[PDB]
PDB file of C-alpha atoms and ligand atoms in Angstrom:
ATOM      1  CA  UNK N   1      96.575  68.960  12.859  1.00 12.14           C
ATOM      2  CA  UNK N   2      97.631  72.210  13.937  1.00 11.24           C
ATOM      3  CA  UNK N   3      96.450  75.499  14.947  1.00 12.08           C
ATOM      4  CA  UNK N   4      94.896  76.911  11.892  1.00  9.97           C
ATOM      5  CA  UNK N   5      92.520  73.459  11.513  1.00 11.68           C
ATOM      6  CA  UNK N   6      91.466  73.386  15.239  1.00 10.12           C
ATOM      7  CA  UNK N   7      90.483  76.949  15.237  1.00 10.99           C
ATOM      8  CA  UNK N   8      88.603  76.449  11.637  1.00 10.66           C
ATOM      9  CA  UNK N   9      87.339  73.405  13.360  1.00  9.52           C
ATOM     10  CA  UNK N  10      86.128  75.056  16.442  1.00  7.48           C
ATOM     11  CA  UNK N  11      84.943  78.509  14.923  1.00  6.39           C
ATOM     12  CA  UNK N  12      83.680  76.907  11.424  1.00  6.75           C
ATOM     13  CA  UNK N  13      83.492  80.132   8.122  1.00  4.50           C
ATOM     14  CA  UNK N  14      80.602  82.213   7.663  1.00  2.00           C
ATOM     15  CA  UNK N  15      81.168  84.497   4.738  1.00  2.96           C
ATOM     16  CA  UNK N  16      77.501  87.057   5.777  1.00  3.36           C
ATOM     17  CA  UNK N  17      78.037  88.830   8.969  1.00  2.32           C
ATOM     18  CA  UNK N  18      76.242  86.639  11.891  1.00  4.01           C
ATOM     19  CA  UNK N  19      75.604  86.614  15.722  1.00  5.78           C
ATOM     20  CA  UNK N  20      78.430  84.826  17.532  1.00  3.12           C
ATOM     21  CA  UNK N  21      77.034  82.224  20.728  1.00  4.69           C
ATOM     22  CA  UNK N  22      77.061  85.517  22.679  1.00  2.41           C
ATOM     23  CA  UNK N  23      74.798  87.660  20.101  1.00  3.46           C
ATOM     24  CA  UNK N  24      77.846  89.816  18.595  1.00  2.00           C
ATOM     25  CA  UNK N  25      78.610  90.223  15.521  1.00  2.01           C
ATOM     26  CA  UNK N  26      81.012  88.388  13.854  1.00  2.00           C
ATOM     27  CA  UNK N  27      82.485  86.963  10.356  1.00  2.00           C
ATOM     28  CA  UNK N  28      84.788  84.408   8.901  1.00  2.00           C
ATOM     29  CA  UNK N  29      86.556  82.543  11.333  1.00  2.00           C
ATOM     30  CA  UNK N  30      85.127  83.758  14.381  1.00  2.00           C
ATOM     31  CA  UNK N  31      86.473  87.423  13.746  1.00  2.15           C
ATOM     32  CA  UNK N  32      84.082  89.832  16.329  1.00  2.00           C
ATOM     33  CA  UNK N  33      83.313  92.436  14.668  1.00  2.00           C
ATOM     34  CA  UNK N  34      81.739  94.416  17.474  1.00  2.00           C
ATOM     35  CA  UNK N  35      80.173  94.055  20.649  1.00  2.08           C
ATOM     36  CA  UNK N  36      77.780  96.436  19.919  1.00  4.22           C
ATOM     37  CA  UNK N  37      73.957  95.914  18.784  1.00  7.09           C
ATOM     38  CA  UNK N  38      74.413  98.135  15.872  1.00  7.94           C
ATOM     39  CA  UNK N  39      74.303  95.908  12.839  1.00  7.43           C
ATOM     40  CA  UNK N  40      75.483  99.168  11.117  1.00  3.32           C
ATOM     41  CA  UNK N  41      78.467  99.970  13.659  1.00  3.63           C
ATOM     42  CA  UNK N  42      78.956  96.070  12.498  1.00  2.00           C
ATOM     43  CA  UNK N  43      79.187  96.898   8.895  1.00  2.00           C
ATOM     44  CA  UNK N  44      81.478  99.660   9.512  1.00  4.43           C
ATOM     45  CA  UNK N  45      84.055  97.818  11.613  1.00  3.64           C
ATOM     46  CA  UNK N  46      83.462  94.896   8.815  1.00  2.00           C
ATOM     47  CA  UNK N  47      84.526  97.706   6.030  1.00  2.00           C
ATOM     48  CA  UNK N  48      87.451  99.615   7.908  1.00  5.31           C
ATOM     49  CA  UNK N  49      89.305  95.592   8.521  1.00  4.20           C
ATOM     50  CA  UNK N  50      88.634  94.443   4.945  1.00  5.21           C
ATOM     51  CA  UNK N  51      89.591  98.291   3.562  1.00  5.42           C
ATOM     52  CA  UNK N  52      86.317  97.772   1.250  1.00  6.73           C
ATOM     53  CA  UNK N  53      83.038  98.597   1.337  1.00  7.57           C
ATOM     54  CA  UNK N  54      81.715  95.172   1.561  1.00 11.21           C
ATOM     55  CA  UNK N  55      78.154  95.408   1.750  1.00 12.30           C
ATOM     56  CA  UNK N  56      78.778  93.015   5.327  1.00 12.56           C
ATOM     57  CA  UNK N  57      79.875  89.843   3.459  1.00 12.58           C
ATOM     58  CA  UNK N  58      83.210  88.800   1.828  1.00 13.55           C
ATOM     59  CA  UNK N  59      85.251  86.144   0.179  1.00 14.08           C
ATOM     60  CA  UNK N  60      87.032  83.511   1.285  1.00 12.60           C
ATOM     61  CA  UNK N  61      90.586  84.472   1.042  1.00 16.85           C
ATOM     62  CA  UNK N  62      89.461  87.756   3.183  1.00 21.17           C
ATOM     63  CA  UNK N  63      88.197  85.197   5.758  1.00 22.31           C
ATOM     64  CA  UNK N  64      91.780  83.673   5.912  1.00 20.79           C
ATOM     65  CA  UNK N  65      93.612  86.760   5.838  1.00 16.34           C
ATOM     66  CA  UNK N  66      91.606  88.194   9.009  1.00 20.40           C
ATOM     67  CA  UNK N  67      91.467  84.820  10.366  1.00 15.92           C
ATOM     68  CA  UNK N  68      95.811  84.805  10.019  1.00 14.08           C
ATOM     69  CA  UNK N  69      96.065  87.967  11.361  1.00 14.00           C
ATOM     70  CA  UNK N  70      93.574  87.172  14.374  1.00 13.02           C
ATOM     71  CA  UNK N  71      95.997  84.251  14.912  1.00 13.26           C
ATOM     72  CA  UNK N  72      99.168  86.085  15.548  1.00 14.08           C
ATOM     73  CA  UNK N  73      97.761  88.699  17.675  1.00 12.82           C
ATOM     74  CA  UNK N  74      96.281  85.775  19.608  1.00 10.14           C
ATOM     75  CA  UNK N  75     100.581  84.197  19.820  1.00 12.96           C
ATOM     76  CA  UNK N  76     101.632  88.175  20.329  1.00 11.78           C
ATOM     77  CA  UNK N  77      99.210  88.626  23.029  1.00 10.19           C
ATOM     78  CA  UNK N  78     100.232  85.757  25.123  1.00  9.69           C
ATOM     79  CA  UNK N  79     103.983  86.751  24.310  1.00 10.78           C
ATOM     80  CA  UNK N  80     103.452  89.803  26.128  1.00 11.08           C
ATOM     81  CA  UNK N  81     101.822  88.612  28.531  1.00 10.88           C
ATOM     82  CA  UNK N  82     103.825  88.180  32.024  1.00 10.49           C
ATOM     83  CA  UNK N  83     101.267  86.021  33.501  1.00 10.07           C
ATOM     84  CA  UNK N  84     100.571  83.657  30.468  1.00 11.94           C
ATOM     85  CA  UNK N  85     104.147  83.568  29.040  1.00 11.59           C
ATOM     86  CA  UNK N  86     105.947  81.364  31.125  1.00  6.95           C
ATOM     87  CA  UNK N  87     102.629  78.828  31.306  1.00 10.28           C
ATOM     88  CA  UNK N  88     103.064  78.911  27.551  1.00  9.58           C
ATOM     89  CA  UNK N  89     106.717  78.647  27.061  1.00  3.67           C
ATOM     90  CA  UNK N  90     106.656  75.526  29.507  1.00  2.00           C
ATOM     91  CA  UNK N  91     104.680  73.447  27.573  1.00  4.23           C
ATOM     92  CA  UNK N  92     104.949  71.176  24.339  1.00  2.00           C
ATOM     93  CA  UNK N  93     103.412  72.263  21.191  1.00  2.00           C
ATOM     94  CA  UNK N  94     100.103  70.470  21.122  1.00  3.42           C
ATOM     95  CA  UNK N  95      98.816  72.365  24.612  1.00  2.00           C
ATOM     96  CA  UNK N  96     100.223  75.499  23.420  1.00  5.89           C
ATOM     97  CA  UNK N  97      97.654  75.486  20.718  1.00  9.58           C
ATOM     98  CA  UNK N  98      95.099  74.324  23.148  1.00  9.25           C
ATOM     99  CA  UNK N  99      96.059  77.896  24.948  1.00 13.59           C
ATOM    100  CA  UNK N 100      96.054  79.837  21.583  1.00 15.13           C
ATOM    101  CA  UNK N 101      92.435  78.674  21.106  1.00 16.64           C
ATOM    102  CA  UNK N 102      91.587  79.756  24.525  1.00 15.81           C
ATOM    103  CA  UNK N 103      92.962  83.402  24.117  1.00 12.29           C
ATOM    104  CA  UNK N 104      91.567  83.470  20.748  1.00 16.01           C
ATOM    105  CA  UNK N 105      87.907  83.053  22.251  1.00 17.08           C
ATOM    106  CA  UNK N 106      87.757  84.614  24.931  1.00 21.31           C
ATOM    107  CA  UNK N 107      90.684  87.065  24.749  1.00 20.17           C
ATOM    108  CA  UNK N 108      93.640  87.669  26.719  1.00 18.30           C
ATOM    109  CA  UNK N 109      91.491  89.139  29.010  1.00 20.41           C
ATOM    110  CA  UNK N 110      89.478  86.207  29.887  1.00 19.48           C
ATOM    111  CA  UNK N 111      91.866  83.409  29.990  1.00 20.47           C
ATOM    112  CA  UNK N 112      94.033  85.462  32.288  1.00 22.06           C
ATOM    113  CA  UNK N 113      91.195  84.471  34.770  1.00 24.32           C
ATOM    114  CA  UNK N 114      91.558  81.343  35.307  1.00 24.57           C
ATOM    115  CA  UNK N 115      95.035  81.727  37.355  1.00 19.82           C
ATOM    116  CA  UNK N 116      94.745  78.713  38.881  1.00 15.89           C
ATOM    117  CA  UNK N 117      94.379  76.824  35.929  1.00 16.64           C
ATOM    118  CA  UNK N 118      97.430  78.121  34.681  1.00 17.63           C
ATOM    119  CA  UNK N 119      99.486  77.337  37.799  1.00 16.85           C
ATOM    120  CA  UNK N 120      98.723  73.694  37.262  1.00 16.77           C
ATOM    121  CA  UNK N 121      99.301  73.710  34.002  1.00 18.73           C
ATOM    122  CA  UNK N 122     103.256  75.037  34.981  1.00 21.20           C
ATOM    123  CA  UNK N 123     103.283  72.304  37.024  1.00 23.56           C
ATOM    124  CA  UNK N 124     102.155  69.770  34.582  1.00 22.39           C
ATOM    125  CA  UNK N 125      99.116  68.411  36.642  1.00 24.20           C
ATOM    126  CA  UNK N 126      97.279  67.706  33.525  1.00 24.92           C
ATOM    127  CA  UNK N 127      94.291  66.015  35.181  1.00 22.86           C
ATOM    128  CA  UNK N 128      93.509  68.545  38.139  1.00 22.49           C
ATOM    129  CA  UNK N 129      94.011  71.313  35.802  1.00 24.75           C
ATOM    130  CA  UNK N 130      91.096  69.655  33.487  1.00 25.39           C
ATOM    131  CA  UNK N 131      88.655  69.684  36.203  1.00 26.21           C
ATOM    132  CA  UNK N 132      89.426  72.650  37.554  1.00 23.80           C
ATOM    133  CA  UNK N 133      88.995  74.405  33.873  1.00 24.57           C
ATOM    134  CA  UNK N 134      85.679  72.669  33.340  1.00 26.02           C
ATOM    135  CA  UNK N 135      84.258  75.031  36.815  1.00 26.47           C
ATOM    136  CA  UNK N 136      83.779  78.006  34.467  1.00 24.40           C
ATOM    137  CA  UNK N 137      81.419  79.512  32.905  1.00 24.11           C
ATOM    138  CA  UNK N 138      83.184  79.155  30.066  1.00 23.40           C
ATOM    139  CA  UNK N 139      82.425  75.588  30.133  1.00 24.57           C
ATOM    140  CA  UNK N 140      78.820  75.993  31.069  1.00 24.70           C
ATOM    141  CA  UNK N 141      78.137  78.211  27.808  1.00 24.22           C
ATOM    142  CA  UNK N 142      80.224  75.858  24.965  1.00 20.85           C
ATOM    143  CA  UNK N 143      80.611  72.504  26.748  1.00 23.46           C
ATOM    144  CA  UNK N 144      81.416  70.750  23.351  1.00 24.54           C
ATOM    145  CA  UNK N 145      84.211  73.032  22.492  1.00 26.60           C
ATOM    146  CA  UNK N 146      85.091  73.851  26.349  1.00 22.25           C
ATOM    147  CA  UNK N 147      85.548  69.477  26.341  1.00 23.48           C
ATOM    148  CA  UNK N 148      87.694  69.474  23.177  1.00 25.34           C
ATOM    149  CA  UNK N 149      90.286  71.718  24.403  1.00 23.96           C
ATOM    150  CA  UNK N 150      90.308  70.542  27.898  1.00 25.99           C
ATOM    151  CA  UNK N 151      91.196  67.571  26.644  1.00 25.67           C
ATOM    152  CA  UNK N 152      93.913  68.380  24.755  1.00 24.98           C
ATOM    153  CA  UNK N 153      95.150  70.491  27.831  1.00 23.94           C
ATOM    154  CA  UNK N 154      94.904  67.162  29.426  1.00 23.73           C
ATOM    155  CA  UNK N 155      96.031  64.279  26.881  1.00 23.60           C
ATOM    156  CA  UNK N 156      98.813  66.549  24.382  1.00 25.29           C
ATOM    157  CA  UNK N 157      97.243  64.735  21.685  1.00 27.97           C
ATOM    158  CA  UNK N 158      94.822  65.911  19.425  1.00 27.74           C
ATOM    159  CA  UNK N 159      92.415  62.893  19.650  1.00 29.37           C
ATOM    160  CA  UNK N 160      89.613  65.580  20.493  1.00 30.01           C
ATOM    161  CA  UNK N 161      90.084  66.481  16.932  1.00 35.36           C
ATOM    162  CA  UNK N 162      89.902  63.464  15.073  1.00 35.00           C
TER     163      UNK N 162
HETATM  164 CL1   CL R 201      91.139  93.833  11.998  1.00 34.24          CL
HETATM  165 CL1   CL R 202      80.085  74.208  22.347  1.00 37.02          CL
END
């Protein structure tokens, strides 16, 4: 297991544009289009990324290459980032792809909300940091997924996933 299978696990591939568990737009591997209710401003943000006129679906090889590109922005953001950075570079490579998945669904943006999370995490207090993650509404709206990568937050292992 790795990255690239728990995202494809936890995002699944849709080749026609759909609604994401939010309503937007979205396509591939979880690739947001647009957050706008414009199935046309969809289309158009669809075309521009793809650099086709697609008609608002693709193939699967265009799925992976957004979906690779979506991954290293998702590694680059939390590089950059001066709160996330040092949570990230303290841990071992299983929960670092437990925080890629985070930042990848809810953005840089959102997972830089949940400070106190992170603190823990530094620390290593695996378990406190699990239950404090799970008070979120993050959790509330995709318990499944919300459990899968708590737990691997909490374990390192990637039993979630098997
Ligand atoms: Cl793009
Ligand atoms: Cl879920």
């Amino acid at each position: 297991m790795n990255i690239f299978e728990m995202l494809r696990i936890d995002e699944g591939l849709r080749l026609k544009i759909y609604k994401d568990t939010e309503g937007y737009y979205t396509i591939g591997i979880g690739h947001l289009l647009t957050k706008s209710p414009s199935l046309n401003a969809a289309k158009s943000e669809l075309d521009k990324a793809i650099g086709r006129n697609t008609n608002g679906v693709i193939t699967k090889d265009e799925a992976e290459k957004l979906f690779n590109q979506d991954v290293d922005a998702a590694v680059r953001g939390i590089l950059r980032n001066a709160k996330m950075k040092p949570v990230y570079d303290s841990m071992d490579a299983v929960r670092r792809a437990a925080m890629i998945n985070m930042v990848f669904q809810m953005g840089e943006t959102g997972v830089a909300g949940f400070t106190n999370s992170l603190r823990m995490l530094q620390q290593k207090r695996w378990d406190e940091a699990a239950v404090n993650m799970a008070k979120s509404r993050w959790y509330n709206q995709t318990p499944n997924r919300a459990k899968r990568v708590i737990t691997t937050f909490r374990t390192g292992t990637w039993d979630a996933y098997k």
